[PDB]
């Protein structure tokens, strides 16, 4: 899906504020997953040397 900004009040079935909060939520999700994976990788044996 793609949306343009002809009406900045409502996009999809979601409000503008709910949409913004969703963007921040997705960013936090991806960065959290990456962070945990990289912590485990830094604790792995392959990083010992």
């Amino acid at each position: 899906i793609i949306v343009e900004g002809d009406h900045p009040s409502g996009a999809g079935g979601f409000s503008a504020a709910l949409l913004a909060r969703g963007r921040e939520a997705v960013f936090l999700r991806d960065r959290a997953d990456i962070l945990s994976l990289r912590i485990q990788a830094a604790k792995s044996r392959q990083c010992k040397t």
Binding site: E4, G5, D6, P8
Partner: protein, 43 residues
């Protein structure tokens, strides 16, 4: 013809170029195409 000219303009304006719209003072702001298309591609 005119439609064709608009077609070129629209395409060019779309992409994120810094668009410079002008407007004669005689014409109403809503009336001028320049600003109207600028608001069409840039809400």
């Amino acid at each position: 013809l005119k439609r064709k000219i608009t077609e070129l303009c629209d395409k060019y304006i779309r992409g994120p170029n810094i668009i410079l719209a002008i407007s004669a003072a005689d014409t109403d702001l809503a009336n001028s195409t320049a600003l109207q298309a600028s608001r069409r591609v840039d809400p």
